[model samples]
Target: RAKVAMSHFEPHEYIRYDLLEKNIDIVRKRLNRPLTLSEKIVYGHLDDPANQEIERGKTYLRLRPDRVAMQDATAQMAMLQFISSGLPKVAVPSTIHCDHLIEAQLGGEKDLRRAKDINQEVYNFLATAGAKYGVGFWRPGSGIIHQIILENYAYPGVLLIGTDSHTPNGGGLGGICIGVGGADAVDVMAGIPWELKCPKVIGVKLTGSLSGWTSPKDVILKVAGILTVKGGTGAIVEYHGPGVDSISCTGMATICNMGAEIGATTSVFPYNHRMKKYLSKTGRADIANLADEFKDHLVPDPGCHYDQVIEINLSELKPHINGPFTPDLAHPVAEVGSVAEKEGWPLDIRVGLIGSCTNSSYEDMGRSAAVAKQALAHGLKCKSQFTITPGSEQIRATIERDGYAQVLRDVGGIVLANACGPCIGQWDRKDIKKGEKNTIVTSYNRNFTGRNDANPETHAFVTSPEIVTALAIAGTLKFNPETDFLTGKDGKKFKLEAPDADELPRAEFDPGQDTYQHPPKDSSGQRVDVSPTSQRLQLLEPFDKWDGKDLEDLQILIKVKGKCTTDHISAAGPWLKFRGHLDNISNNLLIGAINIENRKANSVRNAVTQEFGPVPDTARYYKQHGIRWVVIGDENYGEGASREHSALEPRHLGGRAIITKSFARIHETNLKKQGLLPLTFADPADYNKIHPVDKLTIQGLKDFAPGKPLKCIIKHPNGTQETILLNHTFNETQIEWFRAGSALNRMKELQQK
Candidate 1:
């Protein structure tokens, strides 16, 4: 009802000015003082921020974000869903970035051109649809989504959402940005309330100052060590204390970007001189002035309370490398050599990759180059394979102009394109033996199993860019620059000097001839049509309407045994080529899922044909025979990326429901949006009762409602059945979505009405 049809989109108009004003007043009065950075931003954008009591971890709050951003890989599906909403234009400001599709091989120019040529069809579709629907488009070589948003769109107290998981990177700029699924994006772009549970606040008190090898990256590394992967799950981690003023805005971004590794809702640091400096440098001084006017509301009141508190002395914080498989396996640089020997980890480092959204800032590039220049001066050649993927074209150009690129090149570092590269499994690593255990390191946020090169046996570690560069020069994971000595051309042993850098570039930031393309203001006459025979793009069709009855006798497709991350559910490597086409991409559905029966991935039993086959093939077999199936999974199902393909693929492949011991937040919400039932076992031990060949029945679905439980019956091959209780988190609106087949289907119905 509040949707706006805009020919020229203004981001500020998309924000609810009335809400913002009322919220500021209400919050100030309620707290009786100044506000924390997150509280000000969160309340200012909340649909009902004027309310007195803010319920943490319980109440479902609605928000109207000032803007929305989507990366190319996830944008394909999100724009498709937005188009299906039948809206002539987006109600909010939105942009789609093409960074994820660009491969990293040769340097920027060649790799970007190759990406355009390879993914031309998908790019064309995104560009055409974005223009037709009043959405901005950033060309393939433009930059990473989060970086661009921070440069041009993110401002103090502005609430935003992006389709990619690292959307929280905008929090570095004093914005309350969260990562969401495509369906959620469609809701906001279609002028509906986007929902989230009111997150509990976790206060991180930082004291002293960062020095030596300790950088902002180490701050998050320290946090991951303390919080593990799950500690920040239901909370917003807010940084405060005197040390907050010590880090640069981009440095703060590195900390916030990696917040995804800890499963945080988001992370933030309050507005400070560093942020103002960044804003002025980026030509957004007007925003900086406005933020200064409201500075009191940008920090927490003295008596404000938090759900949890963590204290860290930055002066004492050591350089940490987190991971061999998990990002939370934190080890101090001094202990890495001993730890590696004790753990039997491969000491021979294969590669050291520097740059990603996490650490591609001008500061990061400059800092790492200081070490690279040292290697060049000392006559020490880089022993391990080294590469750099600048976060954006702007950063890359600036670094190149200032000779940081030349310094790294002198030491045998290959400059990759401004893309996700090795960070997202897009790397075509040379001379790597499959299944061979090897050690590698990067400045990337995640080092999960098979995340970089898709080799499960490849041990990847995460650290600061300077640390990565130093290690690349040393050619091993065990080199401790703080104490270990290296041999120079003079044949004398010397310890490497501590690396340092200019927080911002020493030269003017030049994004010469920017690659961004603005959507035409008057595109109401524009048409975006998908070719019928195109293999890369397809117009979506609504699923068949739900039959008005209880579902019974559904076959169990596969009972996943261990960790079932979104990567395992809907893998991204080569299959990413089919992202825009549901039917085509569904082929990889559950291909990475390990079968509990055979302990092999992609292998599942088909009861109808009595044959063993791949997961997708077996599901397609059931669909062709007019049969329904269910997926049974273990704890923390779908625990990785916020890719909605995990939920969409299962729905497209005719899966009726997913019953698991637990679920990661985003995946569960995506399941509900796609009209699939996401159920949890009432009795945790009942997860072991279901066999692959067993038939299942979901009872009480005809009367399905909020806050209710359903009966799940497992019919065994021995003619016996076991009944267990199943719980769900479906609210009234979500239940309606399930009844209407899907959220998009419901949107189509609303348009028809």
Candidate 2:
């Protein structure tokens, strides 16, 4: 099947079968001793694995992944970029899932219908483009992106990249999957090599077994607490040892899916029985047999080396809940009440959201549903607004067939569409009062401020599905299922019992009718039509070419302070509606960024008019005057999602360069791909020297070369100038991308040949 899928692509686009086999042999020889499971997958898929050397954290390796996946939110821009590349069809197997556009409301079918009606233009554009480009399309009600990939395509030893950050969910099946920007997706779809700096390996050795209420979610919650948000940066986490076999394949997925919170490149497990069972259950018994034949290559050999190792005792692990604002702020479930009290977090739980790509497995639903059933039996209804977003149609249909859906409904839980409803800010939160501090809990991976419903005051805590259900029944974040008791209508108090789960579905898996749409085998003859006047999508034109000269007199459009994540650079929420239309989307550029000049976010000074205005408006003010601008940022600029909109918006709005103290690797690559220079301050202290009124000049670009630092002159309003050095990560090819205005431009030029 993999080979047949490869035949759908042009000859040059597919990974040569000989190359993969040769690369694996070469890696085996070079390692000399042993290789980790992740190392095996990475080496096997290298662009030139036979000749390339592995450097733990320095060497840049180009990879050819087996497939690609994108959610509707990011797929819009990715498909737009692919269309702009003039590619007749994708070079690799890819699928676009319409999961992020649907908002949770009345119920699944009703909400799906409303979403289809509201996002007809965007959905039409995606479906049409995907059908024309040999990319499978999953309708809004079908499922979330990561879950669909896991069930239908993810395989052991395959390399995959997706537009959504939680693509690592595929790692549950022993696949090496990473999240990347739309630009990266476009390159791979167009048959170009996707590059990455070799990552440092982190070994997590699991021992003992999970028992009772301790679910797979606890393992990640504990890991997140230990690693924090930045600890896993520039690394691949490999899980090993005895306890790995104890968890189900989907449980491993829950662990890998949340690795994104710790900034890991990806996470993976060995080819164990659990994985084989899941593959067979999901109707991929053939792939399971193929993987079983190659099982030795799918796992690490004894004595494999790792940069760091951490041991976890699954028996000792306790249920944990992370955050009011971040996933790394983990607290054991027992301490949640005291912690909430001490932290001044509102105890009232307004909502309880369960089921996302992170934890919407069969086990997840069964366990959470067990708690819901217990609540119903105890004559206790869900006190807070609760919703469930099933990971895929397969899980949804089977769970519904097995009566888990009815159990949840009995407890007053609204079953939302199998999509990323509230998980990605698409929730139609009806009664959120402004300035009212409230708390909510979810089984989702992320809980960043304003991520759910764009309400900053809504404190969302991340926990297991069963715990979320229990808390929703108690109507407070202070409730502990084990120790806390809830009063019944008869004035009797009762302690909630422990939740139980089935590793697999009790009933046969059922893929409901018309859940997924497969593209035509010969999409090469098809045409994708997008109306010029369509507000949801517009065809992209190549950006203007760079003049091969240094940029001078570029004003600082915005000087950002503190964690200016990609979310801040290109906020989701209402602005997500314009994702496919560059001009329309650019209106949201930096609208959430904090302006260091005045301690206000989204407000920037327009140099031409000397007035404070919205970031996008100010950028447009400069663009209208034919002036280029530069952004000044502190450490870790563009740290969140692999959303390319963060980079594309700045470039589309006339941003010349982004000078920051440091950068998150993916966002840095994104800036270069779009020809927007991402520079780091040679001296960390120099970031403080740039002011809102500063006019910067980037010099020495006429002879631009790899590994060479550029000179920048910052001119203050008082006529004083300071010379600062700037560093970039661009390689020789990336320099050409800059010269050609964009990476796509260079690819187009090569295609013309």
Candidate 3:
């Protein structure tokens, strides 16, 4: 095979297809059955396939991934853990991206400048540390991490684990890319075999074709409405059938990017023409050729069975808009007006946003620009505010040179930086007060409450870029762009035309400014540059190893009433600045979580002192007093972004376990990685039995084993007690992570021996 680069610079780093095929065959022979595309990729990346047990949604798989990508926010903690591991360099190729830290205020250039000025110390630490550890770095203003990976490193049949939840965006290129916590990323960087519960494959059989208004984004939005948020846990969604051919590769990426909202491990399309077209377009035609050669291995075998199958006919799909607060709240474009009217949402659309790691493809930009150009005929500018966030310098430069940027600007659009600006709560939305009620629309994936602007009253909805642009023109959610008419300056009512765009740009993409820093081949043995007094950066110390005794006398710190996600547990917005400093970031712990006792957010009662205070303060008091505590939560705990800080803060604040009715898979693994017990009641109803003032004893750590149900004795302050069974997903090795206090400490021990 000819040497082909993964990206422009890494020419010698080609896919090891032979090894992938060999490992895949090893599992294929052992199982003696057909494998789905997800299984084909997952098994192919197994660290020890010959001995590794293979079972979907049951056995744990130890994986060896080809690459790792981390955005700016999570990389700080990941690099800190890597520093703690004492490893000189990453075990695999990894790239650090400087996105997420830059906030959105004025426009692209000014916002990025202010971010650089304020976050320079943190940036310098990541940059210097990446160089010292032989990791590649993308400087500020380079791009969002997922887009950069898709353009550069992602390819067919490779396995990747990225720090950001949208890292699964790589799956569109026919890879098994999974979103994970920082600790999970650090494990792979330090040469530890990454462990994941083997995911069940949910094959989405697609037939028919896409049309003018309904694009690829609508497909996932449609699926999200069917699957709901929790429907995809412990599974991988793989697209199949003729409908897959209707979408472009970047369009497939847009679908995969939003798959995180459904809680799927990732979403993937079988290696196809779309993927090849993208690979060739991105200057990796040789890799496309390699993919063609390995095409048979890249698709599912015919006889393979999916655990569940959902059929979507793209030809019949309507343009969908999903949100209010959640991405799964789907509404057909024609029906949203009615839903809004019924729900009493503000009809006036305040802002229209397009871009993020999710959308922002050249196609998305071009099509949305087509809608803006339509406004030129009507002499109409954006009636509401419109903003654009380019995912990468390549996409940004390409759109600018292709005239789409100007077309969008002509329609009152402000182009934001390539960073994750409004999408991740980095928006300084000054147009509305904190308590003001307003509505905004975006092409971004997530729309959780307070996600974009940190205003709970701001009704944030997500849809396609074209829909967002049209909605901005209408300036209201009271009309459907597909059927309604807009008034022209001449007082004529005209229906908006359908958007037309090329899947890939006609011209070669221009790589904007120099914003990448590649590590040298040789290291000079330098220490990572971090000031001891720096507020934005801090080196980490190891957690104490487990004392080998059953945890006892743990008081309930907070009984979270409902919908406790990572955003609620650790938060993002302004608190993201303190991510590197564990102690500082811990102050925001569970601040968004509602304490059941008081039915109020952030406020919890201290059992010992009988005083009401903030949740973090209560956790701190318990920690200072050497009293271990536990959190009680409802179903699907840790259900949002795979932020390890959620787990780290709880562990840091002297919490023993998180006893929830259910758990999101990524966060469950994260808690285990951090050496905290993520337990669920064997009987889910037991969650309500434990009072806020109860003292709990986890009674079986001395004999914790795989699939074992442990006993929890809950003693109420009034002297009544209830004994319940606790179930865990811990495998033998994961129990060791608990024994060592964390995965990093276990790695250190292995290094010492």
Candidate 4:
């Protein structure tokens, strides 16, 4: 690979791929000459005429010159939607790598095979979809994590959208990667450019080098501490600093990869040599040498200014971990907070784990190993630690060969499977301890409540493997290794300090599968006979017509508390692991969260699968209880992870719409996807004023249009009616979708066309 140099600093207008790099032939082809430096920087394209057309801070005409990225869960759903929809003619040129399903719940040969087969499964689906759509697959394996892989291959400067919230991980390398939902992914897969409100950019300026023991995770944790998790709503996070070169690519990757934790659109890093080193190590020297292309179409200029300024002093940050409920609730290592004292927080450790796409790099392992060495030297050992899962098979193999794996075990940490074991709640139900003050510190991306298991009382936190290792050595969640010490076998105490980068072994990427091995099989283990039972709930499918039934005509079932997520609605766990067998999964709805008890809802499938069921006739339950409509929650309603079942289940149970202060980007779309109306208060203040069974009547919703706003009259059960303004953000398709009953029905109409 040869290095390229910058040629000219000129601006040109947008052109087709056929004329991408060639100079424009006509004046109209240019966005206007002598582009302002900021426009040129944010757009990341100087020579392209598209820079002139960008009306920064305003609505766009079509699409921005940005790119898209994805992980497995989001990518798979997007593919499913694409194939199911009839947009077979759409062709996208993204460097799509299958990274999501690689992490199996277990690490052995079977797990490896399962991980390997994921790509094949996706390909098989694509093949079938090829009948109407030329579905494509960017072969998986060899590349780094999805976020890292995109930096190596995804183009810079194009409105890039991906399924995972951390899609912003690419922003570290100067690309505009936005996290989207399956619907958006399907639209993108079908060749429709993503539509969105161009976020207001927030400038995060950094200074000072990271001190010993503090990694990039610490930096982001500090950022989280400063801004909190919900701070980055509809905004872009841009980072720049004199200290940009101070952090290594491994450290940078750890930080940017978790941008999703803090809800930022992107946790951006400036282009530097560390990134080049990372590219070279990942078998992409050609990409590192293509810095000129990045320079031409990526990286913001020096004089660029942003709408919001977020400053972080890297020198002052220390090792930290985010707790049980949210990532932004991070505190320094010395303090785990009074979470145990908090009404909902859990205490005892049930599972201590490591490795996620975010923290599963060679560097992460090496740092963890270094910490493990310290613990071993101190004669400190883990007590009752459940499992340790590496991010990738390659990472595990490298550390194992280099003696780092033993170092971990020396501290009593068992190296488990390479896949996302308990990260996505795939653990065996029996494996998880039932209802206790159980605490788990993991290096995974999400730490949402009840995310790792069905029990909300089991507290989970996002921590570095090193921190987890330290915690294991302490035998409890009481020590902060940075400021504490481990007990030596000699009965003396040794100070536990962070490892210097030089002390860690460097990793080399080998694309050959020579070092790769299949998951181990356990044939001799006696099969513990297990049979599960469920309730036989009725399935609700689409009725022939709406018949213009008003909201008053509908009965509300239950009013929920604030910020309900899909977990609060449908849930994802070992309990729902049989979800692939939808019949068993639908009955697992609102299990732990709600107070629903139906003997008939046990071990029985409703007449039809709920996803394909009809709008339920809840009149009996409502008439018996004098219930009218279900009341739902406030700001960030359905926040956290994107699970569509939250809305679908309620709609299937005769829900009219959700009343919250606001809606999350994806769940709102998911509500629209399943044809459930998502309604919010004209004044969120009304949320407190209204009680359960407060009646709402939609008078003109039957004739709602794309641009016109509709009014819903609210009648409190106490006998007062007030006109409420309806503020909804719906596209042409969404409005039509609700009118036709549900997303499935509207999709059926489109497919039949």
- Best by lDDT, which number? 3
Better of 1 and 4 by TM-score: 1
lDDT per residue for candidate 4 within 494-540, as digits (tens), equals 88877743322464642234321111122212221112342211123
| After superposition, candidate 3 runs with Cα above 4 Å error | 523-525
Per-residue lDDT of 1-753 in model 3, one digit per residue for the tens?
A: 556656786766777888889988998899888999989888998889899987788988889988888888999998888887777778788899998899988898999899989998889888888888888999999998888999988999889888888888988899988899998888888877888888988989999999889998999999999999999999999999988888899989989888898889899989998889888888888889988888989989987899999999988888899888888999998989888999898889999999988788899999999988888888999999999998899989989999999999999999999988888899888999997999999998877768787788989889999999999988988778778888899999999889999989877889899988888778646667788888888888889899989888888888889888899898899999999999999999988888877778877878778878898888899999999999999999998898899999999999989999999988998999898999999999888788887789999899889988999989888888879999999888999999999987888888766
Off by over 4 Å in 4: 1-80, 87-90, 93-107, 110-159, 293-296, 337-350, 384-386, 429-432, 502-507, 512-552, 575-585, 588-631, 647-654, 702-709, 731-734, 740-752
Model 2, C-alpha of 274: deviation from truth (Å): 0.8
Sequence-dependent TM-score of model 1: 0.95
lDDT of 3 at 157: 89
By summed lDDT, the worst window of 10 consecutive residues in model 2 runs over 4-13
lDDT of 2 by residue, 646-736 (tens): 8888888889999999887778888999988999988999977887878899999998877889999998989899999998877788988
Pairs clashing within candidate 1: 35-299, 35-300, 36-299, 36-300
Better of 1 and 3 by TM-score: 3
Better of 2 and 3 by TM-score: 3
Model 1 clash tally, residue pairs: 4
- Which residue segments of model 2 deviate by more than 4 Å? 1-21, 31-33, 522-525
| 10 residues in a row with least lDDT, candidate 3 | 1-10
Q: What is the TM-score of each candidate against the true structure?
A: 0.95, 0.96, 0.98, 0.79
